[PDB]
Design a protein around this ligand. Sequence first.
Ligand SMILES: Nc1nc2c(ncn2[C@@H]2O[C@H](COP(=O)(O)OP(=O)(O)OP(=O)(O)O)[C@@H](O)[C@H]2O)c(=O)[nH]1
Ligand SMILES: Nc1nc2c(ncn2[C@@H]2O[C@H](COP(=O)(O)OP(=O)(O)OP(=O)(O)O)[C@@H](O)[C@H]2O)c(=O)[nH]1
Ligand SMILES: Nc1nc2c(ncn2[C@@H]2O[C@H](COP(=O)(O)OP(=O)(O)O)[C@@H](O)[C@H]2O)c(=O)[nH]1
Ligand SMILES: Nc1nc2c(ncn2[C@@H]2O[C@H](COP(=O)(O)OP(=O)(O)O)[C@@H](O)[C@H]2O)c(=O)[nH]1
Ligand SMILES: [Mg+2]
Ligand SMILES: [Mg+2]
Lengths: 45, 50, 426, 426, 32, 437, 427, 49
Amino acid sequence: MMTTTALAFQAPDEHHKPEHARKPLVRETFFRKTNVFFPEGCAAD
Amino acid sequence: QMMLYSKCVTIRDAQIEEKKQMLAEEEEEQRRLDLMMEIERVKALEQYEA
Amino acid sequence: MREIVHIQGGQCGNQIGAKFWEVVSDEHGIDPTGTYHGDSDLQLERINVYFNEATGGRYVPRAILMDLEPGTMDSVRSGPYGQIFRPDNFVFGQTGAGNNWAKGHYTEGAELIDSVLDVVRKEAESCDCLQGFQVCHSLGGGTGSGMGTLLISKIREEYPDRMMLTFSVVPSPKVSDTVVEPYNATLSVHQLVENADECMVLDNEALYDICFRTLKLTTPTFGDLNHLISAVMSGITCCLRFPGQLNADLRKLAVNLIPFPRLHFFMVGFTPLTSRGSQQYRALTVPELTQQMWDAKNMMCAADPRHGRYLTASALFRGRMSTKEVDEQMLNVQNKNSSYFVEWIPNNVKSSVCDIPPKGLKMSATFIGNSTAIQEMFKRVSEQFTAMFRRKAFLHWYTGEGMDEMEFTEAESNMNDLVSEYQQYQ
Amino acid sequence: MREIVHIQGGQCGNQIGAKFWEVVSDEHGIDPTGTYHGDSDLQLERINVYFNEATGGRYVPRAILMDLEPGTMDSVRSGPYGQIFRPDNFVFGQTGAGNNWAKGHYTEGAELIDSVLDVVRKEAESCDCLQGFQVCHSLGGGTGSGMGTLLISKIREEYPDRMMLTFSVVPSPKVSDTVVEPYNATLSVHQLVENADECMVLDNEALYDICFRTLKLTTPTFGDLNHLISAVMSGITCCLRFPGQLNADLRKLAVNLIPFPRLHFFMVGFTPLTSRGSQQYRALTVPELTQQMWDAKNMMCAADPRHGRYLTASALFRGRMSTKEVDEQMLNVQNKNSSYFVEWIPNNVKSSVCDIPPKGLKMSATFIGNSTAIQEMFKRVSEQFTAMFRRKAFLHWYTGEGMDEMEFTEAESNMNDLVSEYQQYQ
Amino acid sequence: YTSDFSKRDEFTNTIRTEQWREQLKGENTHAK
Amino acid sequence: REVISIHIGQAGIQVGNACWELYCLEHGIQPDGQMPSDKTIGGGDDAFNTFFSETGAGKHVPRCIFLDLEPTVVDEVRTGTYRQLFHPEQLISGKEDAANNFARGHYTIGKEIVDLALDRIRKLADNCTGLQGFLVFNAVGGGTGSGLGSLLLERLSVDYGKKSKLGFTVYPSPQVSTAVVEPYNSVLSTHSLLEHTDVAVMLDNEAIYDICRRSLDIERPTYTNLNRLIAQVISSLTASLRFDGALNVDITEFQTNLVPYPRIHFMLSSYAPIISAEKAYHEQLSVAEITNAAFEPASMMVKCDPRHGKYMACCLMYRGDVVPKDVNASVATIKTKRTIQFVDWCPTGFKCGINYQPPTVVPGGDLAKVQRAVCMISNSTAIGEIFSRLDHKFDLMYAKRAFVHWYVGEGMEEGEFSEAREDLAALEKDFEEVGAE
Amino acid sequence: REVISIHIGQAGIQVGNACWELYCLEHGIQPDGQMPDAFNTFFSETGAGKHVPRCIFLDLEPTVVDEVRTGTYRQLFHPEQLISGKEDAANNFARGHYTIGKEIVDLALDRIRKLADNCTGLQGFLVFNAVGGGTGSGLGSLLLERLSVDYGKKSKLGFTVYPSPQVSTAVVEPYNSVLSTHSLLEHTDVAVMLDNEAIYDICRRSLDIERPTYTNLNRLIAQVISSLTASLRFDGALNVDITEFQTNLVPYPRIHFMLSSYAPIISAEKAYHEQLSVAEITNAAFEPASMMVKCDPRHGKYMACCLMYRGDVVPKDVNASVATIKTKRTIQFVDWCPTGFKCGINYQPPTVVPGGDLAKVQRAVCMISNSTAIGEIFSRLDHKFDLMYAKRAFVHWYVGEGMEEGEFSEAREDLAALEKDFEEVGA
Amino acid sequence: MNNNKLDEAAILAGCKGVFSKTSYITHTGQEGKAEEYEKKGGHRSAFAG
Ligand SMILES: Nc1nc2c(ncn2[C@@H]2O[C@H](COP(=O)(O)OP(=O)(O)OP(=O)(O)O)[C@@H](O)[C@H]2O)c(=O)[nH]1
Ligand SMILES: Nc1nc2c(ncn2[C@@H]2O[C@H](COP(=O)(O)OP(=O)(O)OP(=O)(O)O)[C@@H](O)[C@H]2O)c(=O)[nH]1
Ligand SMILES: Nc1nc2c(ncn2[C@@H]2O[C@H](COP(=O)(O)OP(=O)(O)O)[C@@H](O)[C@H]2O)c(=O)[nH]1
Ligand SMILES: Nc1nc2c(ncn2[C@@H]2O[C@H](COP(=O)(O)OP(=O)(O)O)[C@@H](O)[C@H]2O)c(=O)[nH]1
Ligand SMILES: [Mg+2]
Ligand SMILES: [Mg+2]
């Protein structure tokens, strides 16, 4: 037995993320979880 | 522009290849259903003969 | 979830129900031993509509048998799919009605209806959410019509919010089984026009004409006629039991088909009904099914749709079909034969599609038409009623039991205003 | 797409269509069990014009049989390719007419025209675009003439926009089977002149002399004559069923052949018809075809065209032929024998070519010539009608059945004015 | 689709019934 | 930026069953509910957030509520292939249907189901942070789709009000029908859809049948392909929020650019190019031809004649490979054409938008993959013509008081019938008044 | 620079099946549609590796068009452009102009406009039809009317197939011809008549083929059209586009009817034995033994002549030959036009087709003239039209369709007025 | 639908019957007045001077 809704929708064979997706640079770099003061040297400058 | 076009065309090719097999399986399933119906007709004829 | 209880009255209703439960048990895949042996799990999901799970995966039917002579019970239990009922549900008298409506409505009812009301009660609160009641009977017999009518009265007095299906055959002069047919038919419908919410009118001679022209059977016994009626009943209730692209429950069909509270006598039909010799020479399409649907020779009542107008109609399809084909097919039938349909109601067709065809077919359809042509049937029985009432023949067996003459006057008056309002809306 | 439904009336119509459907089936490569087994994919593309797919490669002809005696049904089911018809289309009475036109048009008509109009209506709207109808019958019997006559009338008043072919053999005193031949013929043509769109006049006598001289046949059974008429019918409908360098459908040939509304009775010829002994010493050229076509001994009616004038003529050719050779051959035959044509209509020849020959031949041809020599055959029958009507012989079997005299006088008037205007345009 | 005189009482006649039985016999035998 | 989707009725939830399949396919979500590449492991993406929210680690749940009163379709969903993806609690199923009865859906069973519905939505909104608006899916013919749908809309309006409510409603086709009382249901639904919904988009059945019939050349189409195409058009609508484009618009933009009056909000939608794969190679795809296709009624979703009426304001969403230059040129050609007429009083009648990501294709679908696509959402007076057509067949059945006894037995009366009638009369007055120059 | 081609009728699409076959082999395009700027005039390049012809076949019977659908060029033509009705006009101008045109022309026009929208530098349209049939005449008139109200100013080259006097295959074709010319007169800009007997004689005599079919005729006509549009398709010493015949050959707004011819029509063997130059083929292009319309130009006087040249052609000898022609008195021009020549040269030689009966020639000439012999032809046709119409033959078909006597009379007197115009201008 | 109908609705999808005809944007079929294919358009004044 096969229902039309069940027959029509099957698991997609393969999936990939869209080439242009909005990326949240604001949230990613501006906000930092929990540290008031950081080690003197963490990034070379 | 031309690259986006070419990639879309390749995807079109794959999609057409998929659709042809879809049609094949659909016709095969229809054939199976008709076979079942004819078998049932044969059985009913046998019942009538009995 | 939704629940339909089954009530079988009289010999005809009992044997029809026997075939009906054989069909349903086949479509759900349970053996006459009461055990599930189907393969799809689509069957299991909606058997609570008709069955009670019992220990060992056994599903007993939610049915109640009701009669007055044990021979009917023997005929039920002799045939297969007979050992699956509950012996507590075999509520049953001892004497017999004998085709007397007063005996079925006043004498033996007074001591048997309490017991059937108790068992239909217990069977109602055994489930959670009722959908409706489903009673199979006749209109001429004694133990079926009279007791069934009084039963419908008590149940409608009890549960006024649930649907009600009455599969009732009607008599004709050409198929004249008993002599007091109008005396029983008139009173039964005179009570059904206020109690029952909708009634499927049936007749023997139209079934006879079906098995002879379309089926081309040589010896059409009662088994095949009852097989047809079971097919219609399984079709009308397939929507609850199986998922579809457009679902239509009992109340949904009711509000689509009943435009006025008294106009609820429907004619029914089933397709495909095709002779085995010609089954190889035909096609299986929506146009193929529809041309057989709207055939005048496929109504299961001897009421010519060409002699009246359709108020409304419905079509319940089963199988993988294209809904567009369904819509444009019904639009055609309305566009071509526009004179027969009623004008002040646009779009006189309700349609629905379920995904599961019955076993043995690929596509099926159940047609339900509420036309005004049945007034010809009612005047056809009312004329016999008035003719017999003009000289009170066969009346005293009804008078001496408790019924009086004004009951007959009210019945014929109600019949008269019914055919008058049918004539009015035509 | 474009559609031709088939209708066979009377015993002669039944056997003619039997061979006709055997020929068409052979052309499209379908076996007697109804499945495709051919080789060319061109055959699949135009089988909807005569068939319907039933289920899994089962094609049923779009034909309807109609008679009054079951012996014909036995005969058509006896031979091969007799099992492919849909048994629903074997619509058929039980009593019989008996070469009585009044019985075929007044008594059994109104009891059978009922059902045949029903199956033809169902078969008509089954398909999408009707091109025209095809009816094959006789003019001597009553089951063929009167039935088909009323059927044509009902069809014309229902569907007036579609074309209509009627192939009718006419009676001649040399081969005169029954006695009431003029009584039948005069009334039937009296109806075909206002109802049918065009009629292809045939006769057994011409078929006989053709198989005597040209075929040199020893045993001319009815099978071979019907085989010749089938080759004619396939030749005329070949344009629909196969693509050609120049196509001419049914309505195209009709408008090319009918200059005036009442001038629609044609005569036929077919070629090559060569004996099997002389089939080795022959050539295959278009003049080889044209000499056998335009010979007066190849017309399939008993009307010598050299005793009259051609109004219009048409020639449908089949096979890979050079169109220049075709038209120059037609031009030469119009130039040399210029007296035999009508004057005030230039280029009285319509020609068409289909690139697919009949199975078994390399190059074939079909001639349809609307000449005025047909008024000889109408005088040939109307003088016998006047001879019988002067003495009123055999008349009461029509009078006491419901027919009156003014119908006979009207048939006389219409025949007389028909041949009067034929003589006028001659 | 089918414009006729109503004919659901055409097979109450024993003669009609036996006629049609003959037709069915013929169809089945020819099918065999 | 987030938006939540509610699906009411038999039709709306099947449309959603197509939509969410499409969305998981667009964002790369497997039907069990997690990306193939986890968050830290893959490049950071926020496109999916607008539709569904990542729950905990490696599991995404849609911002939707399917709700209906029959259990059949909804537990069909519960047992379908999207069992792990949809939230178990979000799917809501009642016990028995409204059965094509507006009163039965709005007064009998609504009073008990809508409180639960509004409960879940409330905590859905609370989980949400930057809620743009609502979008609702329903057909006005059915019982559940009309009655409790409108009741839920009313209660959302009293709850929030200030947020936009995009209602994608299915009106009944003129000739083609499957119910009988749908004129009654449509009238009683539009009475509330007029003064509650902010932006209401009409989607007929007949026009989509003709679309898949002519352009997609499929001979026997079911509801599946229809709902696939509608999922495509909704995705094209929300792609501006989902993916960064060259010229983006949000939900509040249709509120301003498209609706000139507090009650004239009824939008015809259209999509182009609706084209099969086989004919794709033969066709050359540029922006001008699809800009014309977006306006032809051979590609509109409502069976009406736009040429008969005059346009008010149009919106042109473009997806894929589209630069502003050629679309400016094409819109110039459209404005200079004369077979279509804009309203006199409105000089600028266009709201364009461009997004970089092209539309996607689904396996088993009939639409081919193309460079670019157009979604046109316009405003005209053919909609008023439609409303007059509906009011006609309404009053025809209302004159004889047919089917009124079911409603008055549920508990409604004749007064609301009369006032909805005169309300639609005034509404027709409004459309013609606006058409006036 | 682009120009599109529409085909209407059972003959038009056969011609097209030869024409587009010729074009693909001229531009090296395989039947699948792609090569292994000059094509831009006939094909639009759909993306990459595919070219669709700017064409639309249109017919009412489906059998010939879906022969094209399933033929060898299934991969070439656009599926939508092939347009097929359901039932044929069946040789009935009234049916093809009022019964079926009302339903099919709306679809045709919305297809041709989106084709014109796809084009950029549209030069004009060119239509292929035969005025004897029912489909090609009726809806052809209806289509041309609606094109003229749509565009108006653009050129519409009509290459019609007229019915030959003594060889013919129809019956009502005089009615079809008269009813078609009544609209072709004032709608077509530039119209070229083409009989069948003349091409029969050419292939019988020059090509010495004793059994020719329609295929060879269409191959020759395609050769003429290609030689006519090679000026647009390729650059030459002297180019002449579509708009030139508009002004160079039509002296009066109602006299636009051109006679065509072609030379050298030369078989595979005789050409190798013979020597090809320009003087002889300029001579050969004027005898009635190599014209495309059966008539006698010696009975007529030329109005203006136009000469396309293909191959290895220098202006020296073509000026010398046209000088010899101007000095000869075997042919007389009209008095009101002293300089009656419009020549053009293109470098690319006419190609050969496998299955064709012509060999490769170094140079060829396509002549298109204008004279009064055509005025004799229309009179010859109108005589046999009135011969049938005098007895009201076949009129019941047309009036049963819905037409009347009025347009019959007015079309008859229109050809009479047209006859008077030719005898006046020829005087 | 359009079983036996020679109308545009039947021809619309290629000899398969469409539910109903649609008016065509590009040209107004029924009316004698039709859309002008090429319409002179005023260019920027700066272009010419
Ligand atoms: N586009 C589309 N429309 C549908 C679909 N299914 C049903 N409809 C439409 O829905 C309308 C009726 O409303 P339904 O959604 O079917 O039923 P409902 O709204 O749940 O109301 P009830 O049946 O009483 O519960 C019909 O007129 C159909 O046209 C579908 O799958 N796709
Ligand atoms: N040169 C040439 N002429 C043709 C060819 N085929 C048909 N014709 C001409 O076409 C005329 C009739 O019109 P057709 O093309 O056959 O058919 P039609 O124009 O579609 O009109 P209908 O017959 O009603 O369909 C005849 O007089 C022929 O001379 C062909 O292959 N080559
Ligand atoms: N379908 C069907 N109808 C029946 C059968 N037996 C009786 N009937 C109908 O029942 C009607 C009489 O009802 P009856 O059996 O006497 O009811 P009861 O006496 O009350 O049980 C008659 O009109 C019969 O046509 C049967 O086996 N099948
Ligand atoms: N060609 C042909 N003609 C026949 C055949 N049988 C009868 N006829 C002709 O039909 C005429 C008589 O028609 P009839 O058979 O009585 O028709 P019916 O009674 O209506 O079936 C005679 O003149 C015969 O020439 C046959 O098998 N083949
Ligand atoms: Mg619902
Ligand atoms: Mg033709």
